[PDB]
Design a protein around this ligand. Structure first.
Ligand SMILES: *[C@@H]1O[C@H](CO)[C@@H](O[C@@H]2O[C@H](CO)[C@@H](O[C@@H]3O[C@H](CO)[C@@H](O)[C@H](O)[C@@H]3O)[C@H](O)[C@H]2NC(C)=O)[C@H](O)[C@H]1NC(C)=O
Ligand SMILES: *[C@@H]1O[C@H](CO)[C@@H](O)[C@H](O)[C@H]1NC(C)=O
Ligand SMILES: *[C@@H]1O[C@H](CO)[C@@H](O)[C@H](O)[C@H]1NC(C)=O
Ligand SMILES: *[C@@H]1O[C@H](CO)[C@@H](O)[C@H](O)[C@H]1NC(C)=O
Ligand SMILES: *[C@@H]1O[C@H](CO)[C@@H](O)[C@H](O)[C@H]1NC(C)=O
Lengths: 552, 158, 394, 158
């Protein structure tokens, strides 16, 4: 059985805290050391800062140590030790290390064994790293070791180059042996024996931690409570209350992160980061259910909660059809999408069990249709739909058009100087539209009525994503590899949230939906329409029907 | 290199063709002789190991256990030098045990076939019995053990 | 200036975008191509250095797929004389840096292998070629030479990245910068003021440091300059290429300036490196080079001439053999050494790993040779050259 | 050939001074080649210098040898150069943007020397517009076109 329903990828090593009944692992994709209970209830990033390529993990949960070890083979390779709660982080070994691939612990002797796949040695050192000895060095037996094991006085290591597990003595490496001869990829090795795990008293057995209890080297309790991502620890230190602050949902290729809106916090853990996606372009969130909707190839929409749970395929191309960009109506429970193949704007019903999708606006040959929509945004309260179209050579011009959320009364708000028009976002509070023009390298602003068009930000290379929250405009530039925040009024005070982030994409602030303005035609008249309800300006709801059916 | 590979030893005249070592040998290569210590060193590409033995062959110690197609071999000082066909480089190890297995050269472009030592200094000098009137030989002379050993042309029957 | 005559360009920057090597004028209003572009099949120019006096433009080609493409070549600005300077011994990762000592006519390059790097030197227009340094833990990639100060600076972006300064023979290695540097992709030397500028695309920082450590100041930084890949210093300005922005910027070399950079060209893809081709940046007068001993007749050295700081006499090394008592001639080494037969050649190796100069120059032989035996008496090495499968020969 | 002259995509020939103006696709620049004489000399007149007055992606180029004016059509680039119908002297100096806007998928541009008017085809709008050489009097001449490619003006006919 699989421990985690979500796809936690690039788990280079796994360490089991048998005393605390917790699981520790290192995520190479996120470059973080994450810890969770053995079942998987609460996964939390334990160490994130100053960590590039964490490979190799080790635990000493015995009551007197409660220590953690890991090895990094990236910039400035080293082996670090920290208490199993994440505190007291020190670099025990940082010299004569190039590629510290392997790492193990000899619990009785208090010696940790590690290997280098480049310098080709097998040394061990005390917990503080003061005393260091070499077992195997300057030997062709060790060519590309990966993992290590220590049963009694025998050390077993797997070499990926020689494709053979080998055994020798753990003090001088004399009794060399070949346990296995041909393994396609030996990689990790573990010695399954009760002696390998010394039993000890578990302080967490009687802890009052609400979500997670982790052993700590610091006394007197020798344990501490930990909060899952998006949660804040109460001063009582035993109960964790859920945080409610908004955060930037920064979408990149192959990963989606949650970045706290405060520029001071440089930790990408405002939520459980989605991993394993392919060509992520845009994202939408269901605040009420704490869901995150994103689209990945081929034209398929997936959803997961903010805590990395229930990650499924909400709607497939087989039933719903292809979709590229999203815009979620949180009032009427309708998900508006842009179809890349058909070059049209559609709507999908989240409410209920059966998924109904219909095409609202299609390329009808006039200048008021959809030529090649890139960004779409919705205003459920006012029943207006705003989208950005790059246009086509057939006659449809690059435009920022508007329409009612039933697909009627289309009009061209803005046009001209919209070369390489990117996604467009809507500020509901001020009824203004923010869009990014890559060709001009600017972020313009205009009213929802096609008036007061102004250039908010100048001198951009390839702006991709735009999000407006409170009085700040958050945008991302792919070529600059930067996420920047400016005042939405004038775009003057520029603050770099993140930098040197490759393959940036669109983003949206995970703000709390305004509960006051949480009613429209469909919300007030639920179940009136048989299949699809669409709000229209003035509080009137227009019933529509899915593909293949017609309204009676 | 025939089946049941043998380290066949004889005199310079080939008086006593006695195989020194015949077991545990597939493709012997890079025979070397520890002149200072009177020992026999060799490598085997199929076995991928470097072993030493007495001149008679009573003793047999595997100096180097891990190797990749070790083909050449030579010995000098307290170090033993060999070449690998796979990594295409020259290594070095302590002749007594092999502790200091390091690489003497980078990844050579081609495969190093044979490695030898140039003893510019005094080599294994030994008075030649063949010096005195061809060592009492009307024909070719071969200075074997305990005096010279005369040799004859192979083309003719002698 | 007569508005009728034509003369070749004397001052321009040579940009080394991977597909082709092109030159541009420093005057922004001038759009002419200052050199015949170097393009063709298998053109992957990692770095470019120029010998102004001889009028040559060197570059290092790298190709993982094809081994024959990995070479160090040179060509005159008019695109006339193209010849492969270095084609043998190039490692798996290829040549990763070129520094041309115009004063002594020595070409320094960092041969890169799978697990080790060689900082080799080649005397131009000759066959002498010596591996000055062989390192494994460090990863010297881009190299720049300062003959006037008799120093050799390179950049390392491997584990424990740093910028190292060493003498012209790579002896007195000192780490100029060890902190605040991650990927020093590109290095340049200001000849006039004795500064070592560098660009770090990982930290998005353009910084300079004097040759003797001391002042380390940031010229440009921030969200902008996302990926500077190569820098060069001319007069009071630094010209650097940015891969992401596809522009060849130019700004004042002095720090604390805030004027926006001037763009020389735009929309150019796969920018790698830039260098300045001018007689000013490569002086050759004896007073200009602080009386460099290797200026004349290669300092009288038979094989290689290196000017060390303080030592007015030209230190001489040997590409092969050993330096004799005369100090300017190289003869065969008199110490015992190894001889090993490669497939097409017979070579030699000293017993001491530190000494990299071969006891004698490599002798190329027939298709295959499988043994070596040397007869000192006759000073000859017997070898069983197996010319073909069936054609054996002693 | 590309070996001597270099790559070229579109042509515009000066029949008075015997110079052939070309558009370089790879370099994204406007060049000139000397037909007169035996040796072919080519130089780059206008190149993408990063300003809005350079050449982003030139598609059509026409020349007026008598008045010494060069007119070209550029589809622009995302770097900042806008889709424009620009003009310059035939030596590469004094560039200016005659027309801009509504030039999506701008095709080749031809010059009517007799009337000093420019005719260009905008595929995106599917029209063939007309304007003066001084950036004035921009009018739509033909409507309802799918993908107009070539334009030639002779006498009173288009
Ligand atoms: C290696 O050999 C090449 C080819 O002989 C040398 O290139 C030559 O370098 C000399 C000195 O710089 C050049 O002389 C100069 O010619 C220009 C006109 O072309 C003149 O204005 C200068 O005053 C000077 O007389 C020579 O032209 C040039 N020839 C070629 C084919 O490039 C190179 O210098 C030699 N380098 C070494 C390390 O010896
Ligand atoms: C990371 O490194 C920086 C620079 O040395 C240091 O200021 C910071 O405290 C370090 N943080 C951690 C978690 O090691
Ligand atoms: C193991 O190594 C020790 C020390 O070298 C040696 O005495 C012993 O004989 C060896 N035993 C085996 C099984 O190799
Ligand atoms: C060997 O060959 C040489 C040269 O032909 C000849 O002088 C000599 O007599 C031969 N035999 C001996 C015993 O050297
Ligand atoms: C070599 O470098 C050291 C500093 O590491 C310096 O003190 C010494 O003077 C240098 N060599 C000379 C010129 O003696």
């Amino acid at each position: 059985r699989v421990v985690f329903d979500s796809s936690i990828i690039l788990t280079e090593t796994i360490a089991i805290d048998w005393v605390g009944r917790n699981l520790y692992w290192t995520d190479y994709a996120l470059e973080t050391i994450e810890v969770s209970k053995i079942d998987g209830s609460h996964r939390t990033v334990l160490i994130s800062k100053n960590l590039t390529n964490p490979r190799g993990l080790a635990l000493d949960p015995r009551m007197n140590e409660h220590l953690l070890f890991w090895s990094d083979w990236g910039h400035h390779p080293r082996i670090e030790r920290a208490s199993m709660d994440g505190s007291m982080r020190t670099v025990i070994v940082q010299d004569k290390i190039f590629w510290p691939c392997g790492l193990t612990i000899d619990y009785p002797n208090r010696l940790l064994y590690f290997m280098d796949s480049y310098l080709d040695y097998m040394d061990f050192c005390d917990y503080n790293g003061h005393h260091r000895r070499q077992v195997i060095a300057s030997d062709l037996i060790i060519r590309h070791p990966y993992a290590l094991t220590l049963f009694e006085d025998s050390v077993y290591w797997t070499d990926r180059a020689t494709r053979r597990v080998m055994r020798a003595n753990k003090w001088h490496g004399g009794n060399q042996s070949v346990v296995m001869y041909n393994i396609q990829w030996p990689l990790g090795i573990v010695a399954v024996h009760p002696s390998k795990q010394p039993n000890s008293v578990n302080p967490c057995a009687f802890s009052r931690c609400s979500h997670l209890c982790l052993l700590s080297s610091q006394g007197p309790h020798f344990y501490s409570c930990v909060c899952p991502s998006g949660w804040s620890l109460s001063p009582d230190l035993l109960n964790c209350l859920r945080d409610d602050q908004p955060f930037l949902i920064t979408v990149r290729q192959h990963i989606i992160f949650g970045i706290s809106l405060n520029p001071e916090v440089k930790s990408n853990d405002a939520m459980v980061p989605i991993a394993g996606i392919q060509n992520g372009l845009d994202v939408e969130f269901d605040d009420a259910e704490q869901y995150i909707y994103w689209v990945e190839n081929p034209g398929e929409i997936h959803r997961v909660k903010t805590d990395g749970t229930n990650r499924t395929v909400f709607a497939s191309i087989s039933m719903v059809g292809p979709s590229m960009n999203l815009a979620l109506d949180w009032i009427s429970r309708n998900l508006y999408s842009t179809n890349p193949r058909t070059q049209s704007i559609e709507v999908l019903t989240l409410h209920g069990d059966i998924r109904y999708r219909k095409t609202l606006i299609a390329n009808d040959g006039t200048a008021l249709g959809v030529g090649f929509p890139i960004g779409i945004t919705v205003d459920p309260a006012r029943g207006k739909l705003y989208w950005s179209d790059q246009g086509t050579d057939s006659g449809v011009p690059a435009k920022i058009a508007s329409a009612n959320m039933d697909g009627t009364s289309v009009k061209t708000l803005f046009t001209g100087n919209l070369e390489h028009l990117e996604c467009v976002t809507l500020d509901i509070e001020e009824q203004k539209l923010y869009w990014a023009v890559t060709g001009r390298g600017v972020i313009e602003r205009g009213n929802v009525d096609g008036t007061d068009r102004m250039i908010l930000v100048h001198q951009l290379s390839h702006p991709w994503g735009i999000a407006v929250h409170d009085s700040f405009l958050y945008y991302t530039d792919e070529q600059y590899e930067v996420i920047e925040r400016v005042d939405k009024a004038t775009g003057a005070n520029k603050i770099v949230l993140r930098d040197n982030v490759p393959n940036l994409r669109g983003l949206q602030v995970y703000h709390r939906r305004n509960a006051a303005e949480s009613s429209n035609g469909c919300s007030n008249n639920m179940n009136a329409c048989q299949q699809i309800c669409l709000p229209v300006p003035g509080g009137l709801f227009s019933c529509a029907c899915a593909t293949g059916f017609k309204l009676n | 290199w025939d089946t049941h590979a043998k380290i066949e030893r004889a005199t310079l005249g080939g008086n006593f063709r006695v195989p020194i070592v015949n077991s545990s040998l597939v493709m012997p290569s890079g025979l070397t002789l520890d002149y200072e210590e009177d020992l026999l060193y060799w490598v085997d590409a199929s076995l991928q190991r470097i072993e030493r033995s007495t001149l008679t062959g009573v003793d047999r110690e595997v100096i180097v256990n891990a190797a990749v197609h070790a083909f050449g071999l030579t010995l000098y000082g307290q170090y033993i030098y060999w070449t690998d066909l796979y990594t295409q480089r020259i290594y070095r190890a302590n002749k007594y045990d092999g502790s200091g297995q390091i690489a003497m050269t980078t990844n050579l472009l081609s495969q190093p076939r044979g490695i030898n030592t140039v003893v510019k200094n005094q080599k294994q000098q030994c008075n030649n019995p063949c010096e005195q009137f061809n060592g009492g030989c009307s024909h070719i002379c071969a200075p074997g053990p305990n005096g010279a050993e005369c040799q004859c042309p192979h083309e003719g029957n002698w | 200036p007569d508005n009728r005559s034509c003369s070749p360009y004397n001052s321009f920057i040579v940009v080394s975008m991977l597909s082709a090597i092109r030159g541009f004028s420093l005057e922004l209003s001038d759009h002419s191509e200052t050199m015949v572009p170097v393009a063709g099949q298998g053109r992957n120019a990692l770095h470019v250095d120029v010998d102004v006096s001889s009028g040559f433009i060197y570059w290092c080609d790298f190709s993982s797929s094809v081994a024959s493409d990995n070479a160090i070549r040179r060509i005159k600005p008019d695109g006339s004389s193209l010849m492969n300077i270095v084609t043998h011994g190039i490692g798996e990762n290829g040549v990763r840096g070129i520094a041309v000592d115009w004063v002594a006519g020595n070409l320094y390059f960092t041969n890169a292998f799978v697990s080790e790097t060689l900082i080799e030197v080649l005397r131009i227009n000759t066959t002498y070629r010596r591996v000055l340094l062989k390192v494994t833990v460090d990863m010297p990639r881009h190299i720049v030479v300062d003959p006037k100060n008799r120093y050799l600076f390179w950049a390392d972006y491997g584990q424990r990245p740093k910028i190292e300064r060493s003498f012209l023979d790579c002896t007195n290695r000192t780490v100029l910068v060890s902190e605040g540097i991650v990927t020093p992709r590109g290095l340049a030397v200001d000849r006039s003021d004795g500064y070592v500028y560098w660009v770090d695309d990982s930290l998005d920082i353009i910084a300079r440091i004097r040759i003797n450590g001391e002042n380390s100041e940031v010229i440009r930084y921030g969200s902008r300059y996302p990926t500077p890949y190569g820098i060069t210093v001319f007069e009071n300005s630094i010209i650097w290429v940015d891969r992401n922005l596809k522009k060849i910027f130019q700004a004042s070399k002095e720090p604390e300036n805030t004027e926006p950079p001037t763009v020389i060209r735009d929309n150019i893809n796969w920018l790698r490196d830039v260098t300045i081709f001018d007689k000013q940046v490569q002086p050759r007068s004896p007073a200009e080079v602080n009386n460099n001993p290797c200026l004349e007749n290669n300092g009288g050295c038979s094989h290689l001439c290196f000017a060390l700081p303080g030592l007015h006499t030209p230190k001489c090394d040997c590409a092969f053999g050993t330096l004799q008592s005369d100090g300017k001639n190289c003869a065969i080494s008199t110490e015992n050494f190894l001889i090993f037969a490669l497939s097409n050649s017979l070579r030699s190796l000293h017993l001491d790993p530190e000494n990299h100069s071969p006891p004698f120059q490599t002798i190329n032989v027939e298709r295959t040779v499988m043994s070596l035996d040397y007869d000192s008496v006759s000073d000859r090495i017997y070898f069983t050259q197996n010319l073909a499968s069936g054609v054996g020969q002693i």
